[PDB]
Design a protein around this nucleic acid. Structure first.
Ligand SMILES: [Mg+2]
Ligand SMILES: [Zn+2]
Lengths: 315, 63, 148, 116, 189, 48, 179, 59, 61, 63, 149, 185, 376
DNA sequence: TTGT
DNA sequence: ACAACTGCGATTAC
RNA sequence: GUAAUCGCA
């Protein structure tokens, strides 16, 4: 799915129960489709497929990895005192059960030693409150329990969990516009999202940009010249235009990994699937009944939400 | 052959639940494994056991 | 199960001879009430009287000071047979390694012919003497012995 | 390294390597950087040194020395703190310039162009 | 159109800028949304976003915030939003951006009449996306063009220029209303 | 408890009502019982 | 929001395809088109008289709207199509409850009764003004729901009566009189 | 009052090009073909041509 | 306009008038320049001769 | 996909004690079940018939 | 349109006694945990006490929500939307201005960790993960309900 | 406010004719911007004119450099305001020749004739000179006679000064309100 | 006539952007080239670099940000770097009337000569302006008169042209009634041997009223191997206290007898910081320890401790200039040191010492949030 | 699968 | 052996 | 014309 750069990355993270040798939609029991405490940090608890296959198609956590034994593994910090005194271990699902994993902070003092403070923790697939002396592990990573779709929602704590799935599904539908603008408020994951989307020109060699053109970019390094071909008004699988624009000017040095050009729905190296417009929350003469929006003509005559769509016909 | 065609993963899991010292390499349904299975089964009747959750990730593999 | 709350901050005054001592389901001590009683919340300017005759739990004591909107008593009048009553079981998991100990009120014979299950005739405590359990082979037992 | 280019262009040399480089003859300016994995400021200094090495492909030599591996050598070089840069000139009569703390990349460029 | 917080809507009217409500600055709002969705679908982060966005636009800043900022303290998001709005109000002297009486809310006027509204409204600049589903793709209409070889019913699909289907749940409604001739015409000719 | 425990609710939540009550307590517009507005006074101000 | 219970907004690009035969007959009757082919070519050319004839055609014709989740009997109703300049079918707000419709992406179908008996049935039985009570318990199904209810509540809420309207007791001491 | 967590962490320049060589980004993604060639997993056409020519000359 | 970057600390001033300008929320030359002689005189502990001293030091530049 | 191994589920009968069963899962997908009735009754559910003798299976294995 | 009702952050008014109630509840919970470590009470008593006290606190908060709005801020936009009948319910507004209470984990077993924060203050990571259980149950319930209906 | 926004008219470029481009979604050698980017840049060219009708302009630049609004040759009636707006950038010695049609209208114009004479591309134009407007009414404190003070803030785009915009809005309002004082038809 | 109400202080030393003087040998090492894995060491930092301190300018910046007035005394060249640092200090409302400009030298660069002979033995041909301040004509006397606290680090002791200037400034400050704050912040050469560092810093130690030293520095000056063997002691058969049974991290409180060799008559307060986790205070009358905490893990990605110690010193100086009963009363001393602890805790969450410096409101908020109402 |  | 929401739209594969 | 897969409300 190449409707937008986000779809290309979120498509490859799907884990499916239904398939050859797996539970069919009808076959799947209710139990199969609910979160199990084991899914913490390894699977997304708010990304599913809406329909008859609800709870059967899910995404994969941001920090997860697949293990030697075929098991998804998650990164847990070890607060236990040792020689190194710090570790990041990808504990497997069965191993983390026999550990006191506390996700809370330590900013509490009650005239006693700090290790005597209490904190919610997880043990044997349960929740309980224990002292800081007895907690073996700690989950520090903020994006550990979510996926790319949910993590792009700012202030997700103040939103209901039910609407999170709707927002994740609707972020997938965005159309790349003729012009792109970054978001004033963001979660900070748009950078790596645009980096790993694949619609960005990243240099594979250090050097200087000797020649700049719309069709190609010439990068001269270590006595060798490399040519990078750009994309000019191509067509995706979902009838959405793909285009790239140069970001670096002529005569600047670029390392192996930096951004040479900006693809569609990406500006300054960050994912940009929309625009920033002034909004007021009030009823206006019924035009807002149910859900409906009243918009001004400025969005029309200034090309704020203009988009290009390309459809192919072949005989 | 298909019932005894336990994978390497299968061997490991069998060893975990039923304490066995069978080497990882011998990925076959040995009769000791069956014997042990029977032992645990009878032990479950007297309370010395724990049933297994089939929705646990540790009980699932990713292809 | 309505919960009676203190109308204002003040002392509680009632006659403890009418109420019978009991133990609440939360492990707390309380006074069982079976007859219409009058309790007085003695505040700076006013006195309040609130209580309900039927079987209720009094979670306070005479002369005790209580703050406003605290749970003084639990009416617990709602009581009936539950057709959906389920004998749910919960397990207690040890939080430290060691050995088991019981002094009294525990049967010395297993409930079944085979197994470690033991039954308790009366209430008692189970003591886990802290320690580190190791695995000892036949070879190690020859050199590793008691009090080494 | 023919098919895939190396990500980092600054090499970690030892103390004997630095002694041999200073003792020998050089045709390009030399830049010595003392770092430690632990110091926070050094994380930035390394990025600026990478940018400088990219800007100066073969007109200057940039090397880095880990203070944890060579502590006595760093102490003998009169190195007070970690974000320290040693600028060695090519001609061996001129005096070396030692800079301490985070300095702008333009300052490094001007030093290499004029002082060295 | 949609927002990142689960807010979705369909455009219903394109009013000119002169009819749009304007702030005390003098600028007409680009979109107007229904304020009754917040208690219904329980989306409170949208308010925060709008406000922070107004603040940023004025101060020329972009905010990349990791989720669950309330691990530091209580009402961390509220403190951040109100602090940034105050600063914007002080630096660009637009007193309206932060109202001490009702933080985050301002009093706007009507573009048509020019009279102020009674209660203050939320003014912000959220991130709105345009979704793939579009009206042009969904428009369809058939008169009498093509039929299936065996069934001889009209064809299916918008690209194939086919009509709409009258299912069993609609025949039931037609029979409950009592329109026998309409059902007969639809089922035969 | 003999020693005072720690809680996230130990502090008083800031509000517009408390700030306005502090602002109008000066200049003699209103009078409050003490130097810091209490929750009952904040509710009364929210009302009036 | 400015339509009546009997009127519904209908786009022109849909109406021209639905009522195409009627506008062909109109072009043939008036001295605007000689044959069916010339009339079809003129309709394809989007001539201005074609829209006038289309408006004159459907002034008394009923349109049958319906929804995909037709659970109750109010899923299919009848309205008077009004020509609009757009691609979105306008609907009266008070009639939304019946269709369980929200403007979040929902779509609807349109049906044109050809026979005179079908037209009479649609105009008499299936109209909205004749169906204002749900067939479950006979309760009003078309009532102010979200914004009109808020407006009515603001209108009839009242006024600050006690301590809110006055700071001191009026004992120590409404005004306007309208005929 | 002022937030405990510094706001300067959230603040970001609007017209800023994100440097993917920072401390918060992972290592650059290696091209699959070049990565397989450098480790010897996939040989070049020249090596296969030379091997086939040697096998033909031997026969 | 480089007057913004020219703080009063760089210009050599007596300690008394320096503290007076610091208390009067004057940190840059531009600010002083915006301020008028009468206004400057208003600041506490600021003598008329001081207005002369700051004017002379400014005219020196 | 579910990992191969031994699973030990239980199921309560309509009248009497709860039935305990152990299933062994293979890579191909074999199901060598084992069940226990109110008595010892260590019966495999491999055969479609009422039951099967675990002792007979062990003797065939080589015991 | 003339009045232009709107909802803001400061417009979500909590009852003026949430802090005291939550503080005494967590104090009693800590005392009971300490005495459970001593051996005065067993596990089932602690479970019952925690569940009952947090459910009672949530119910009292929801009960006192409406009188607070009626007496203190009668013209509150959230209160207007709830009382008029346009959109919202007492349970839904309790999630916004009160507390989410004790969510139930799958298989009908209580989580035992209370959600002491509403959507205005902001839930924690654990509380959000717990509410994910309710969201999944809701969506699967919606699907099965549509099919069965 | 309603007069300044929507009742004031201006002049903008409405049609652009390119020499040897296949379509408006392609790139021409020697220019950093595509045809669409050049059209978008020409769309934001502010002009000043006081007469109605269509006029013709052209752009004839050559050699490597940057073509701006100064290269545009205009009829004597039309003039340029900014004179330094960026039309396009040439990175090679090329001859850049383009034709422009200048029209004066009001409001916004939809580019309806997409299918038209080949080689000419129509660009939608917004003829609104006033960007934003605002007003505030402060009291005068005159006791019984409740007099007030009016303030007006006008933001134009250079085509006309704010005072000229105010006078034109006043004259347009008077022209709109005059017909009611004529004899009945 | 009277000085401004906030008491002014003086920070004396070298102005450096992000200098880290405290360098030792770390046992744990990360990847040499990948600087994206070096944040794992900020998380569990080496003992000596748990709460590092930097240039004196950072102390003045933090002091001004935490509320108060401060001035920097030093010399910087007329180059772009010196003017950049001066502008940075002025934008944050730090006084520079005691900062001198010399066109003859350039700030930050020290000319040296390799002179390889059996070893790489360098020598200083010229010195930087940051390390070259003349005692005679480069000391402003008015700032010394107004100053109540005089702050400087041992970095000035390394040079041979700034020791006399520091001694003259100390004498002039004591002449008008000011106090001397001495933060060791030992540089790399000062960690060779305890005897040489003790003999070199004895002169500045004698004339210092307030001295703040790290735990590692205090142990290094007091037979570090003894305390290293002490912390590793484990009871063989049975413990004698509850702390030994639970095996928590060691937080040793040094008895005044152990600190007696380092105690002089003119010493009022001695602070032994344990890296924003414990804080020890010593006075002629009373001795104690203030409990603290560290939560760098809460924000894993930034995690920079570069400016913690400077913020702690700034908060200590602020509370000493504001609260005059800290010397006499112990509980007030602890309640005020909690402020500096909270300041350090806030300062560890942001990369950049000058960038992530706490304000007074944020520090008070964190102090109230972390500590119970009785303690604050 | 789930139950009929 | 039998059945388990209603329809719509898009793609690729035969 | 049938499948597979996703989406829609
Ligand atoms: Mg809908
Ligand atoms: Zn938040």
């Amino acid at each position: 799915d190449r409707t937008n750069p986000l779809t290309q990355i979120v498509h490859g993270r799907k884990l499916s129960y239904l398939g050859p040798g797996g539970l069919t939609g009808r076959t799947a029991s209710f139990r199969i489709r609910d979160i199990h405490p084991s899914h913490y940090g390894r699977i997304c608890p708010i990304d599913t497929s809406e329909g008859i296959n609800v709870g059967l198609i899910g995404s994969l956590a941001i920090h997860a990895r697949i293990g030697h034994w075929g098991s998804l593994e998650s990164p847990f910090y070890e607060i236990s005192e040792r020689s190194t005194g710090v570790r990041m271990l990808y504990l497997s699902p069965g191993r983390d059960e026999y550990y006191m994993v506390a996700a809370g902070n330590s900013l509490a003092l009650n005239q006693d030693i700090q290790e005597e403070q209490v904190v919610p923790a997880r043990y044997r697939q349960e929740f309980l409150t224990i002292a800081w002396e007895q907690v073996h592990l700690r989950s520090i990573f903020p994006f550990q329990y979510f996926s790319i779709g949910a993590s792009l929602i700012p202030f997700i704590e103040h939103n209901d969990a039910n609407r999170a799935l709707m927002s994740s599904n609707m972020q997938r539908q965005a159309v790349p516009l003729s012009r792109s603008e970054k978001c004033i408020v963001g979660t900070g994951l748009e950078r790596q999202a645009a980096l790993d989307s694949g619609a960005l020109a990243i240099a594979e060699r250090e050097g200087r940009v000797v020649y700049t053109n719309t069709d190609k970019i010439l990068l001269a390094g270590n006595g060798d010249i490399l040519s990078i071909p750009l994309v000019i008004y191509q067509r995706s699988n979902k009838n959405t235009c793909m285009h790239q624009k140069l970001q670096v000017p002529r005569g600047k040095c670029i390392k192996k990994g930096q951004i040479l050009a900006d693809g569609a729905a990406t500006v300054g190296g960050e994912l940009a699937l929309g625009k920033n417009v002034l909004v007021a929350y009030m009823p206006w003469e019924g035009y807002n009944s149910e859900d409906a929006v009243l918009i001004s003509e400025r969005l029309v005559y200034e090309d704020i939400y203009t988009s290009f769509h390309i459809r192919k016909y072949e005989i | 052959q298909q019932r005894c065609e336990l994978g390497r993963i299968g061997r490991r899991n069998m060893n975990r639940r039923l304490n066995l010292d069978i080497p990882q390499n011998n990925t076959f349904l040995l009769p000791r494994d069956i014997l042990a299975a029977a032992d645990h089964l009878i032990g479950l009747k007297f309370g010395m056991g724990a049933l297994d959750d089939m929705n646990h990730l540790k009980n699932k593999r990713i292809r | 199960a309505e919960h009676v709350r203190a109308p204002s901050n003040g002392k509680i005054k009632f006659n403890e001879d009418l109420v019978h001592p009991t133990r609440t389901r939360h492990g707390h001590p309380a006074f069982l009430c079976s007859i219409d009683l009058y309790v007085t919340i003695e505040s700076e300017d006013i006195l309040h009287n609130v209580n309900i005759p039927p079987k209720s739990l009094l979670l306070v004591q005479n002369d005790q000071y209580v703050e406003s909107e605290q749970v003084i008593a639990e009416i617990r009048a709602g009581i009936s047979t539950l057709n959906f009553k389920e004998k749910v079981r919960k397990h207690i998991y040890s939080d430290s390694d060691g050995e088991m100990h019981w002094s009294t009120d525990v049967y010395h014979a297993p409930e079944f012919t085979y197994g470690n299950v033991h039954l308790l005739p009366k209430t008692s405590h189970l003591w886990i003497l802290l320690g580190r359990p190791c695995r000892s082979s036949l070879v190690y037992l020859s050199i590793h012995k008691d009090q080494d | 390294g023919k098919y895939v280019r190396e990500d980092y262009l600054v090499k970690k040399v030892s103390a004997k390597d630095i002694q041999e480089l200073i003792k020998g003859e050089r045709n390009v300016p030399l830049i010595i950087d003392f770092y430690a994995t632990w110091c926070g400021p050094c994380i930035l200094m390394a990025q600026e040194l990478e940018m400088l090495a990219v800007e100066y492909e073969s007109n200057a030599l940039i090397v880095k020395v880990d203070t944890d591996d060579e502590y006595e050598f760093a102490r003998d070089m009169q190195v007070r703190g970690l974000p320290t840069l040693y600028f060695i000139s090519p001609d061996p009569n001129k005096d070396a310039i030692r800079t301490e703390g985070l300095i702008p990349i333009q300052m490094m460029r001007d030093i290499i162009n004029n002082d060295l | 159109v949609a927002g990142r917080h689960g807010n979705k809507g369909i455009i219903s009217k394109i009013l000119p800028r002169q009819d749009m409500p304007y702030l005390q600055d003098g600028r007409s709002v680009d979109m107007v949304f229904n304020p009754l969705g917040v208690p219904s679908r329980m989306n409170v982060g949208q308010i925060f976003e709008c406000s922070l966005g107004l603040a940023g636009s004025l101060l020329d800043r972009h905010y990349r915030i990791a989720p669950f900022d309330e691990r530091y303290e209580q009402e961390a998001s509220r403190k951040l939003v109100f602090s940034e709005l105050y600063e914007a109000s002080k630096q660009t002297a637009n007193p309206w951006v932060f109202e001490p009486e009702y933080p985050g809310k301002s009093r706007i006027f009507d573009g048509r009449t020019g009279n102020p509204f009674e209660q203050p409204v939320i003014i912000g600049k959220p991130y709105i996306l345009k979704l793939i589903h579009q009206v042009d793709d969904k428009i369809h209409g058939r008169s009498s063009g093509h039929y299936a070889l065996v069934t001889q019913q009209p064809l299916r699909g918008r690209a194939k220029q086919g009509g709409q289907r009258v299912g069993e749940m609609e025949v039931w409604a037609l029979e409950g209303f009592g329109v026998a001739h309409i059902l007969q015409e639809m089922l035969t000719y | 408890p003999e020693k005072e425990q720690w809680s996230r609710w130990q502090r008083r939540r800031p509000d517009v009502e408390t700030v306005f009550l502090k602002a109008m307590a000066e200049t003699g517009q209103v009078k409050l019982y003490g130097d810091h507005p209490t929750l009952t006074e904040t509710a009364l101000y929210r009302a009036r | 929001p400015s339509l009546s219970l009997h009127r519904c907004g209908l786009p022109r690009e849909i109406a021209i395809e639905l009522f195409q035969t009627f506008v062909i007959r109109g072009l043939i009757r008036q001295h605007l088109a000689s044959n069916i082919g010339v009339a079809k070519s003129k309709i394809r050319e989007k001539e201005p008289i074609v829209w006038e004839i289309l408006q004159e055609v459907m002034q008394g014709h009923p349109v049958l709207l319906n929804r995909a989740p037709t659970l109750h009997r109010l899923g299919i109703q009848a309205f008077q199509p009004v020509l609009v300049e757009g691609r979105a079918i306008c609907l009266h707000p008070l009639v939304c409850k019946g269709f369980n419709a929200d403007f979040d992406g929902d779509q609807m179908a349109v049906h044109v009764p050809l026979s005179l008996e079908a037209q009479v049935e649609a105009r008499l039985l299936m109209f909205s003004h004749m169906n204002l009570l749900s067939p479950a318990i006979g309760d009003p199904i078309s009532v102010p729901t979200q914004d009109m209810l808020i407006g009515l509540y603001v209108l009839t809420s009242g006024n600050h009566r006690g301590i809110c309207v006055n700071r001191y007791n009026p004992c120590n001491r409404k005004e306007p009189f309208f005929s | 009052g002022d937030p405990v967590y510094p706001t300067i962490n959230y603040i970001q320049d609007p017209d800023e090009v994100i440097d993917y060589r920072g401390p918060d980004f992972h290592e650059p993604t290696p091209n699959m073909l070049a990565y397989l060639k450098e480790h010897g997993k996939i040989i070049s056409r020249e090596e296969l041509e030379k091997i086939l020519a040697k096998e033909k000359t031997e026969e | 306009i480089a007057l913004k970057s020219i703080f009063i600390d760089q210009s050599e001033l007596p300690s008394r008038i320096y503290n007076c300008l610091k208390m009067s929320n004057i940190y840059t030359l531009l600010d002083l320049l915006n301020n008028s002689q009468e206004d400057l005189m208003k600041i506490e502990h600021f003598r008329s001769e001081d207005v002369k001293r700051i004017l002379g030091i400014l005219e020196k530049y | 996909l579910q990992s191969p191994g031994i699973y030990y589920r239980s199921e309560l009968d309509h009248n009497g004690i709860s039935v305990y069963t152990g299933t062994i899962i293979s890579d191909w997908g074999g199901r060598s079940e084992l069940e226990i009735d109110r008595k010892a009754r260590i019966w495999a559910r491999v055969s479609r018939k009422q039951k099967i003798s675990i002792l007979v299976l062990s003797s065939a294995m080589g015991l | 349109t003339a009045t232009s009702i709107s909802l803001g952050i400061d417009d979500l008014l909590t009852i003026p006694s949430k802090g005291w109630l939550v503080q005494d509840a967590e104090q009693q919970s800590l005392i009971l945990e300490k005495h459970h470590h001593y051996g005065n009470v067993h596990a089932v008593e602690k479970l019952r006490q925690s569940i009952e006290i947090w459910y009672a606190t949530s119910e009292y908060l929801r009960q006192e929500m409406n009188p607070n709005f009626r007496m203190t801020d009668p013209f509150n936009p959230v209160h207007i939307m709830s009382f008029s009948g346009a959109r919202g319910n007492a349970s839904q507004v309790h999630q916004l201005v009160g507390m989410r209470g004790l969510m139930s984990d799958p298989q009908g077993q209580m989580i035992d960790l209370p959600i002491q924060s509403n959507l205005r203050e902001g839930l924690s990571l654990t509380e959000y993960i717990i509410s994910c259980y309710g969201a999944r149950k809701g969506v699967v319930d919606t699907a099965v309900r549509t099919s069965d209906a | 406010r309603r007069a300044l926004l929507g009742e004031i008219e201006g002049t903008c470029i409405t049609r652009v004719k390119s020499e040897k481009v296949p379509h408006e979604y392609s790139t021409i050698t020697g220019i950093q911007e595509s045809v669409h980017e050049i059209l978008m840049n020409l769309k934001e060219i502010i002009l000043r004119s006081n007469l109605y009708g269509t006029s013709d302009a052209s752009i004839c630049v050559k050699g490597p450099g940057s073509v701006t609004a100064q290269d545009i040759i205009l009829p004597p009636y039309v003039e340029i305001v900014d004179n330094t707006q960026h039309i396009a950038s040439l990175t090679e010695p090329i001859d850049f020749c383009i034709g422009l049609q200048i029209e004066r209208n009001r409001g916004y114009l939809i580019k309806t004739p997409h299918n038209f004479q080949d080689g000419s591309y129509p660009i939608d134009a917004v003829f609104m000179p006033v960007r934003n407007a605002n007003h505030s009414i402060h009291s005068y404190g005159n006791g019984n006679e409740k007099q007030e003070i009016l303030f007006l803030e006008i933001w134009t785009n250079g085509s006309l000064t704010p005072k000229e915009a105010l006078h034109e809005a006043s004259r347009n309002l008077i022209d709109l309100f005059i017909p009611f004082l004529h004899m009945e038809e | 006539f009277p000085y401004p109400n906030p008491p002014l202080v003086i920070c004396f030393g070298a102005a450096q952007k992000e200098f880290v003087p405290t360098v030792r040998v770390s046992h744990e090492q990360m990847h040499q080239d990948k600087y994206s894995e070096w944040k794992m060491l900020q998380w569990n930092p080496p003992e000596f670099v748990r709460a590092p301190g930097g240039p004196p300018s950072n102390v003045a910046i933090s002091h001004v940000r935490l509320g108060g007035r401060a001035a920097f005394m030093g010399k910087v060249g007329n180059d772009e770097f010196g003017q950049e640092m001066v502008l940075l200090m002025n934008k944050e409302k730090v006084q520079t009337r005691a900062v001198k400009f010399d066109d003859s030298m350039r700030t930050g660069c020290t000319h040296m000569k390799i002179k390889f002979e059996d070893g790489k033995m360098k020598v200083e041909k010229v010195k930087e302006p940051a390390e070259d301040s003349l005692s005679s004509s480069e000391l402003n006397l008015d700032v010394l008169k107004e100053a109540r606290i005089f702050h400087f680090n041992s970095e000035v002791l390394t040079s041979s042209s700034m020791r006399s200037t520091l001694f003259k400034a100390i004498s002039l400050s004591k002449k008008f009634g000011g106090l001397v704050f001495f933060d060791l912040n030992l540089p790399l050469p000062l960690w060779r041997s305890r005897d040489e560092t003790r003999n070199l810093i004895k002169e500045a130690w004698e004339q210092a009223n307030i001295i703040e030293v790290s735990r590692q520095e205090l142990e290094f000056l007091l037979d570090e191997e003894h305390y290293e063997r002490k912390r590793n002691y484990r009871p063989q058969y049975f413990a004698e206290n509850f702390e030994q049974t639970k095996q928590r991290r060691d937080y040793y409180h040094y008895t005044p007898a152990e600190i007696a060799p380092l105690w002089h008559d003119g010493l009022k307060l001695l602070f032994v910081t344990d890296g924003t986790l414990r804080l020890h205070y010593y006075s002629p009358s009373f001795d104690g320890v203030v409990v603290g905490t560290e939560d760098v893990l809460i924000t894993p990605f930034t995690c920079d401790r570069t400016g913690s110690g400077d913020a702690v010193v700034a908060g200590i100086m602020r509370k000493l200039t504001t609260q005059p009963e800290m010397y006499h009363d112990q509980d007030v001393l602890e309640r005020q040191l909690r402020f500096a602890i909270a300041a350090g805790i806030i300062s560890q969450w942001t990369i950049g010492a000058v960038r992530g410096f706490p304000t007074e409101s944020a520090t008070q908020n964190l102090k109230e949030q972390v500590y119970v109402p009785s303690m604050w």
